[PDB]
Amino acid sequence: KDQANVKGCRFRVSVALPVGAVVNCADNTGAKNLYVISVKGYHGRLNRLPSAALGDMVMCSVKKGKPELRKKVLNAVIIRQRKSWRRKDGTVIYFEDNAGVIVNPKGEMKGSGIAGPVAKESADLWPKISTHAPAIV
RNA sequence: GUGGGAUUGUGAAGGGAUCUCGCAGGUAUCGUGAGGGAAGUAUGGGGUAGUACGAGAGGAACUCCCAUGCCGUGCCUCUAGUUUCUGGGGUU
Ligand SMILES: [Mg+2]
Numbered sequence A: 001k002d003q004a005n006v007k008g009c010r011f012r013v014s015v016a017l018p019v020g021a022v023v024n025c026a027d028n029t030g031a032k033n034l035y036v037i038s039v040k041g042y043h044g045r046l047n048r049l050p051s052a053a054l055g056d057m058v059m060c061s062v063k064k065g066k067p068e069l070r071k072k073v074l075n076a077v078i079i080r081q082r083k084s085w086r087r088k089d090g091t092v093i094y095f096e097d098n099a100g101v102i103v104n105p106k107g108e109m110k111g112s113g114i115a116g117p118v119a120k121e122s123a124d125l126w127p128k129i130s131t132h133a134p135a136i137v
Numbered sequence B: 001g002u003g004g005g006a007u008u009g010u011g012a013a014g015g016g017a018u019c020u021c022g023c024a025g026g027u028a029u030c031g032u033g034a035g036g037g038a039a040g041u042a043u044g045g046g047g048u049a050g051u052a053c054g055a056g057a058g059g060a061a062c063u064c065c066c067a068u069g070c071c072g073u074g075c076c077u078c079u080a081g082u083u084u085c086u087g088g089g090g091u092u
């Protein structure tokens, strides 16, 4: 797909990462973490923090990492979350950590490698991440 | 008419008289539905299609069908939270 709007292409996933969450960066661009600024395709409700889950594209800034990647608004895709979600086949699953990868607004991954497993939901929404994943889980 | 009560405050006991009230409904279901309230609402993807239009750059929509926000009404199989079952352990 690699299209910014993903909600109508993937099933319900429990929201894990509200605005202000800091998640690890799984790529090798040089960034260490990502600061969730907002979530693509989020429709607001009064007082509700925009919250990301797997496969979502987020706006982010880099808080720790090499200087050229910092002090900017970047795009990123969530690939792991600690909050558990229920898959349609009934299985409840979660990751040990939260992680994301830096992308351009059209879904192309900056960086050429991914550390750790990628959720199947995220990989189905984004083929480039899927090809770079060392395991789809 | 029948019954039961009662008259105004200065004893007692019997007589009337006059009022007032009751005299037919209880109890248990299934329904009607006047009137009132009132609620669903959006986005995306597939396909149409890279085609109609267009020199070209670019570039649509509906039958359909697949999701997802929000809102609403519930529920507790699962997963999560909660424990004064102070349940069972452990430990100062
Ligand atoms: Mg507020």
Ligand SMILES: [Mg+2]
Pocket: none
């Ligand atoms: Mg319980």
Ligand code: NA
Pocket: B035
């Ligand atoms: Na009515």
Ligand code: NA
Pocket: none
């Ligand atoms: Na439990």
